[PDB]
Amino acid sequence: ERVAVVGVPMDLGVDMGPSALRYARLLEQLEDLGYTVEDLGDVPVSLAYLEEIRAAALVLKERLAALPEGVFPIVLGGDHSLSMGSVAGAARGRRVGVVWVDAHADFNTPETSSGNVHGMPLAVLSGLGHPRLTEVFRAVDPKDVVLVGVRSLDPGEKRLLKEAGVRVYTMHEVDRLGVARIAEEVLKHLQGLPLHVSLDADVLDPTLAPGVGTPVPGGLTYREAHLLMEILAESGRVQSLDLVEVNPILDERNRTAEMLVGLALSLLGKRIF
Amino acid sequence: ERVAVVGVPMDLGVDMGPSALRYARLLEQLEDLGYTVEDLGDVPVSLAYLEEIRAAALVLKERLAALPEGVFPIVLGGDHSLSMGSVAGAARGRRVGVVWVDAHADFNTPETSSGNVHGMPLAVLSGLGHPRLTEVFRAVDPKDVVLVGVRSLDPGEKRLLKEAGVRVYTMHEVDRLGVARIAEEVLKHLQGLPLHVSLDADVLDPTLAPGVGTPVPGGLTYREAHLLMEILAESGRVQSLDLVEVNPILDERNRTAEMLVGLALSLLGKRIF
Amino acid sequence: ERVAVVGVPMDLGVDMGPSALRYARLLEQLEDLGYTVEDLGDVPVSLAYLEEIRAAALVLKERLAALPEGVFPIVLGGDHSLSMGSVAGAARGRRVGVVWVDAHADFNTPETSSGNVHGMPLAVLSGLGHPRLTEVFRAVDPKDVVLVGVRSLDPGEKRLLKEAGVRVYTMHEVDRLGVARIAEEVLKHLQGLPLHVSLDADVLDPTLAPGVGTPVPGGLTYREAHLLMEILAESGRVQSLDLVEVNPILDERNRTAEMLVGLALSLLGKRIF
Amino acid sequence: ERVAVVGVPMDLGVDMGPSALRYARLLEQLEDLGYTVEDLGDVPVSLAYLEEIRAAALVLKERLAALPEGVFPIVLGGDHSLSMGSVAGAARGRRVGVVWVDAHADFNTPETSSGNVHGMPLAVLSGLGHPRLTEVFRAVDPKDVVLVGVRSLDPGEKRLLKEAGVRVYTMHEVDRLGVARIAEEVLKHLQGLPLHVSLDADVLDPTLAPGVGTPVPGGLTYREAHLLMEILAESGRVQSLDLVEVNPILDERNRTAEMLVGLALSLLGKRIF
Amino acid sequence: ERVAVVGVPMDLGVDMGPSALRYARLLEQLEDLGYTVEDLGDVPVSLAYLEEIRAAALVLKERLAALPEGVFPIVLGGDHSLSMGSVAGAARGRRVGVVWVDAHADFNTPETSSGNVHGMPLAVLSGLGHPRLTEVFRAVDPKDVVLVGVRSLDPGEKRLLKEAGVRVYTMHEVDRLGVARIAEEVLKHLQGLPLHVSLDADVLDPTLAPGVGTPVPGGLTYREAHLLMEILAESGRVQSLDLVEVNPILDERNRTAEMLVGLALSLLGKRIF
Amino acid sequence: ERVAVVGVPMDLGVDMGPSALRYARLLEQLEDLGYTVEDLGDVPVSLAYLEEIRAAALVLKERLAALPEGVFPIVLGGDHSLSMGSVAGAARGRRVGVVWVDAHADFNTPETSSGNVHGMPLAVLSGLGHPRLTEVFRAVDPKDVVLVGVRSLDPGEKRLLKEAGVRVYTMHEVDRLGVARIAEEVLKHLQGLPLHVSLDADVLDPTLAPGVGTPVPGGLTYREAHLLMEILAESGRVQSLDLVEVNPILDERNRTAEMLVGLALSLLGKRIF
Numbered sequence A, B, C, D, E, F: 001e002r003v004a005v006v007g008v009p010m011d012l013g014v015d016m017g018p019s020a021l022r023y024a025r026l027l028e029q030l031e032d033l034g035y036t037v038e039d040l041g042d043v044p045v046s047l048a049y050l051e052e053i054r055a056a057a058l059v060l061k062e063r064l065a066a067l068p069e070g071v072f073p074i075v076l077g078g079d080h081s082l083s084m085g086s087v088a089g090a091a092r093g094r095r096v097g098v099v100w101v102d103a104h105a106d107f108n109t110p111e112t113s114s115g116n117v118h119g120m121p122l123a124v125l126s127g128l129g130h131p132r133l134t135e136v137f138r139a140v141d142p143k144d145v146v147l148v149g150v151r152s153l154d155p156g157e158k159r160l161l162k163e164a165g166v167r168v169y170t171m172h173e174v175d176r177l178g179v180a181r182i183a184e185e186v187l188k189h190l191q192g193l194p195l196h197v198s199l200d201a202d203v204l205d206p207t208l209a210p211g212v213g214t215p216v217p218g219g220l221t222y223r224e225a226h227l228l229m230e231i232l233a234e235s236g237r238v239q240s241l242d243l244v245e246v247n248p249i250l251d252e253r254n255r256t257a258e259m260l261v262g263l264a265l266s267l268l269g270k271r272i273f
């Protein structure tokens, strides 16, 4: 019944993502859906910038852990790095499954690689990476993580993912199996666990979502993304959500932000029938 | 072997739809397919406009009912309201299955809703709605009706559809099951019955068919629409067809009209092999 | 030019009907008439027996549907129940008119009645009755059905027939109008449609055709039956035929089977001049 | 989400009530509350005047009955007589509970009494009174009616009310039990039913609402009226509302109209917290 | 249309339950209802007996999973322990709602308690209990389970039920709310899911069903039990059924078995009107 | 103030019902209630027996029609067939509502069915059935009839009841709505009309009233039956009553007759407070 929205304008043009999502009327539409919604505003944001990222993500983690239970958090973001804080915070010390819907795996470590932290959050959350990050953000077991829509990986990432035993559904599996079957398998693999969904806008085909920093051709269609959100919603186990990497500076008429808002609605129960 | 084409330029810019469809060479192409074709011209068209709609639809019903049996009728339209007359007329007092391919259910009543009659034809045909319409247009049992491609419904419509027991395949089912399976299920549900296909241009994704009054994203692809028509055609039970809601004023290079003409050809037997 | 004969020795002594008909030289006489004939042998036959009947009729339906078009099928039978499969199969998914020449209407449902399925085939074909049957055998529309020679009906049957709007020519109409006029009206009522003739031996007066399970006095004379067949033949629209209910165990010198073979020859063009 | 406002400037100076209510910014404030509002304008108004009243109320009934379901109607009025049409029209043929908040019971018949029709609407609605009125306005069972705030009754009225079994909460009961308890009892007595609230401005103490034709001392306080509206709103069952008897000619700075507009907002969800 | 009946004479005198139920003409009456029925015979049955129970339940699970889809399975039993296999098998790997109509919750684990396995099946099915059982029988999410008619619970059970979040309707709720409302709430709570109904004879008042191992006073009346079955039947979502714990050795004239057969008929569509 | 009791010992062991009812001191208790009572004795009684039934019922009709108005008639019976005469006679040519409290609908016609006339009285009274009966006993419009407590119907009866538009409250509705609400709805449905109550002993659960020819489990409880009678009594519109189908030969200590006598007392005003 209750939903809390918090923004993380972190870009360490994605820092404009939270405003774009708000402008796509995420809040008004959540209310039309029957939810009572509260906008918590934005979390202050001031190798590269590791400490600054740590500081911001820490505020986020603490902000989410404070929420009275029963309040569904939706984090609007810039960098996917914010997920280190959102997942750790939203998990509330309990075992949660993570469904990472992204064109990338974000499973790099300082060792595997351009040194961008927003390319290592899922690894950090899994307990792999720089100590200053894992010490406060490790929050999920690699076996309780599922990647969906992946189509671009670094050599080092591939190794780590395999070593860690993370279930990965690349676009190859999406094409081969279909979203309906994959969604079912995702729920089975993470059965009995509350689920945190982290949705990176770049999972959508670039033709549909141009407003992303690292576009990769051959992504999910509008319909597949909605189906995935609908099936995950049906499970009734989704407890939190990240809407990240929206970059209005590369977008067209804010359609990428509008896309993600529509997907959030589907994930929270909006149905045709 | 025989096909009769009649237009209903009713908009009570869709009134330009019949001309657009004729300009897309529906007639010439039906002949290339081996059918002998006759253009019957247009039916005269002069809450909102209920009596005027009733009058026009009545002329249409009578015109179709008077056709010699064995002559396949294709009604070109503006408003989907014309289907009250086309289905009642093409049914010939007989039990017919109705396959409504539309982004909407057109199952509203004066009570459920903007008062537009073109949003109530399927309800009327099923015997629900204003007495002045149901008294002369009721023509199908709700159980012999199947909706395909629906992605937008009003609250009242949902209730009526469930109460009536109408089989509904929304885009969610389309994504989940696939058109092939849905087409098979349609034929099974309406097994042994002649079939009337009512095709609303808006069932197609807006990116593919922009020339429609009420576009709704996430529609059928070009291929899916043809596959549906081809499987229905294989049954050999299709007996009549409506090609409605084409709006050239909102279209681009008449591509929406061309889309529907191609779909009509597939429904009438055109095959790749 | 081509005729295919198939037997259905179903009695769920009419199971001996196919052999009796073959022994009456149906095949040799069809050849003398100029047809190239192929005997397909018999379809395997193993409330009462509904599933067994469904199985056998389904094999029949598939066998007929698989025939190359242009091949006239003649089904020899025991129970008239086989018509659920012969009509559905011979229809080939297209609209066909049914001329049911029988002393009975076979229009009962499980509700209207002794529970014998061979008393419900026409109702099933018309979409009325047990779901397990109508779901695979519904194949004709009530207004495309004409009963000729009826002289015995159950109370429930009368209701269903009137509700369904089936054109019925009982012996009262035969006596009042004459076969010539009735045949003309049958063709008019089913104008433009290919015709399936289902001939039950009991339509003939018992004095002429004793070999039937449920004889009813006051039936058609030898000449009337031949006149009906000859006029239907002249239309050039007859596409399939059932020769059912021949029971050699109750017959005299196989004359009933010989009667039906003679009528089949008239239906297929045999003429005095 | 949707609200429709219609006025009935009937005084057969209360005819100036609709304008006064509109000038109190009822519409603008409903929008600030989040509702989408449509002003339908006024219904034409031309023993005493029974036929003229009937005509106007009939137009009103039809106008409300034609509204798409889901649209909350608020009728602005002069005479409370308009309620014969508003309740009958807003009921939509279904069983509805009526909460009549008035200093009077308006339960007179031509027999019980000054012949003013605006003193008989509730009786008429309950099926008691002149045939010309009950024949088209009877719309509620006396047992689904609850009067709140009554402090002035005619001898005849008392008899009819008791005979009919109408639940009446006079100011004596208000003083004794308190509005909170009375509001709870009202919802219980009319449990499971959609509610129509008819608010007569004279239910409020004259010192607070001087702009009324028949002021009666000892009415509801500002706070009690708002509490009643808030508790009724919490039920989520209120479907329609009448704001009647506002007379600007006897008012002071339009405060009575402003009072009612404030109460309408409370009834529609406005809350301090 | 199709029903398969299988018995599990497990008592590890309830082992005589399957014969008692068959003697109550379950099969003959299902056919009178219009279903085609097949008796699959019985599944071989040879802390306490955990492995033997596991073996039998496994055979049952496989037998049901192997059934062609569309075939409604009814499992006749001795011990309710058989449900570990019937539910897992009937679920067919898909998400199913479970309606457990029992005087007990059968939600014990080896830890919570007399060590009887037939007092732990629902817990096992929910994934709680001995590993040897949960590894092959876990098949439902605690949130998709609803208990109806409970009137006897162990301290440990109460904890587990609350921890798991299982919706429980004890006889207190039944008395307070009424079966009509409870049935509605059950369907809502398990909306959109196929339903498996597990009916324990002891849910019925002992005065009505004496033939049960653990009778508990204050149970459901004959009418309440039929109403529950009728409302669940109306949903059209019931896909499987268990009829367990019938003990003819403690019964009177087999009335408990006859009671359950009647309830099965109501659940499968039998209605007064 | 005045009550007339007449018996109809018709069984064409229910013929012993009138004596059983008298022995239950119906008369003495009616006097204790304040009524002046007169026993008119019994009406002479000499497909099946249609003419004999007609003759007896006719004598009954004439006997009741001849009673001075203001005298409440109570007819004690054997067969419910007597109601053809009691209702027609008690109606006195005026429009009366009929409350048929029975486990059966008695709405059969010679066509719908074992040919027992006592299974067709309500139909006859409604103008459906054998001409010999309807010509002299038709006396009520199907729309002024309400059945309460029904739990057993023949297929044909269902059709006739729906066709005729008779309001039917089966035990399913009783369980769902409760007698209180049903009694209110009965009075509303028959508002403004004098009421004739026909009470068949078999409406009561067999466990409570074993003395009936066709017992059907799941009937009304003692309290429900008294509540129904008390609410009908409160209306003050009940004008006549039949107490039928009491069979002392199948009864236990005349408790069924005592049950009905008690119910008559409640119907005639006996109250606890």
Ligand SMILES: N[C@@H](CCCC[NH3+])C(=O)O
Binding pocket: A009, A015, A016, A018, A019, A020
């Ligand atoms: N509309 C936002 C711009 C996004 C800024 C994020 N820091 C603001 O101007 O407040």
Ligand SMILES: N[C@@H](CCCC[NH3+])C(=O)O
Binding pocket: B009, B010, B015, B016, B017, B018, B019
């Ligand atoms: N070419 C057609 C145009 C279709 C018009 C819509 N009422 C004409 O104007 O004759």
Ligand SMILES: N[C@@H](CCCC[NH3+])C(=O)O
Binding pocket: C009, C010, C014, C015, C016, C017, C018, C019
């Ligand atoms: N001539 C066949 C007899 C068919 C009668 C029924 N199955 C045979 O005996 O081989």
Ligand SMILES: N[C@@H](CCCC[NH3+])C(=O)O
Binding pocket: D009, D015, D016, D017, D018, D019, D020
């Ligand atoms: N303001 C209104 C006056 C109240 C009218 C009521 N009929 C007008 O001048 O339109």
Ligand SMILES: N[C@@H](CCCC[NH3+])C(=O)O
Binding pocket: E009, E014, E015, E016, E017, E018, E019
């Ligand atoms: N009639 C059953 C008896 C059920 C006893 C429990 N195993 C049998 O086949 O012997």
Ligand SMILES: N[C@@H](CCCC[NH3+])C(=O)O
Binding pocket: F009, F010, F014, F015, F016, F017, F018, F019
């Ligand atoms: N005691 C009554 C008995 C009624 C049985 C019905 N004809 C008598 O012999 O007069």
Ligand SMILES: [Mn+2]
Binding pocket: A080, A102, A104, A106, A200, A245
């Ligand atoms: Mn990412």
Ligand SMILES: [Mn+2]
Binding pocket: A102, A103, A104, A200, A202, A203, A214, A245
């Ligand atoms: Mn990414």
Ligand SMILES: [Mn+2]
Binding pocket: B080, B102, B104, B106, B118, B200, B245
């Ligand atoms: Mn449409």
Ligand SMILES: [Mn+2]
Binding pocket: B102, B103, B104, B200, B202, B203, B214, B245
């Ligand atoms: Mn549309």
Ligand SMILES: [Mn+2]
Binding pocket: C080, C102, C104, C106, C200, C245
């Ligand atoms: Mn026949």
Ligand SMILES: [Mn+2]
Binding pocket: C080, C102, C103, C104, C200, C202, C214, C245
């Ligand atoms: Mn026959």
Ligand SMILES: [Mn+2]
Binding pocket: D080, D102, D104, D106, D118, D200
């Ligand atoms: Mn008033």
Ligand SMILES: [Mn+2]
Binding pocket: D080, D102, D103, D104, D200, D202, D203, D214, D245
């Ligand atoms: Mn007043």
Ligand SMILES: [Mn+2]
Binding pocket: E080, E102, E104, E106, E200, E245
């Ligand atoms: Mn149990």
Ligand SMILES: [Mn+2]
Binding pocket: E080, E102, E103, E104, E200, E202, E214, E245
């Ligand atoms: Mn139990």
